[PDB]
Design brief:
The chain is mainly β. The protein is built from three helices and eleven strands; from the N terminus they run E-E-E-E-E-E-H-E-E-H-E-H-E-E. Strand 7 and strand 8 form a beta hairpin. The chain is globular. The N and C termini lie far apart (32 Å). This is Collagen adhesin. It is found in: Secreted, Cell wall.
Length: 146
């Protein structure tokens, strides 16, 4: 099994025209967690977040599920909060995140100004805590070449 970071984010320009496909890769190695996982996401310029595009690829040693944002929340996995049109906070509750990976897929529409950018960016601040470890806080910015 490949050794992935607890969290990483990437994107590409595959599929739909004038859209950026983003991916939030959470706990791919299915480690245990001692608290909720909280992501504060601030999207870069030249993009308009498609708030209805979110899907969740959830996997553990019991089952594989691909659900919508509404289902993600209805089933007790977590909650999202769109704080602006392009910024959102996403939380994964402790219990269902234990030994479970989440690949969150969503898109953003590329604006006229965005079409002329060299790259597309998305920044995040994530808080989480693993077993026998102190809480972790990571911040970074991912880029997609245009």
């Amino acid at each position: 099994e490949r050794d992935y970071p607890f969290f990483y984010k990437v994107g590409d320009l595959a599929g739909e025209s004038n859209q950026v496909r983003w991916f939030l890769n959470v706990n791919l190695n299915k480690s245990d967690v001692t608290e909720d996982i909280s992501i504060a996401d601030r999207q870069g310029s030249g993009q308009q977040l498609n708030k209805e595009s979110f899907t969740f690829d959830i996997v553990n040693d019991k089952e594989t599920k691909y659900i919508s944002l509404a289902e993600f929340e209805q089933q007790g996995y977590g909650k999202i909060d769109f704080v602006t049109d392009n910024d959102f906070n996403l939380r994964f509750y402790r219990d269902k995140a234990r030994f479970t990976s989440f690949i969150v897929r969503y898109t953003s529409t590329i604006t006229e100004a965005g079409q002329h950018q060299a790259t597309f960016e998305n920044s995040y601040d994530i808080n989480y805590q693993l077993n026998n470890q102190d809480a972790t806080n990571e911040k970074n910015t991912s880029q997609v070449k245009n």
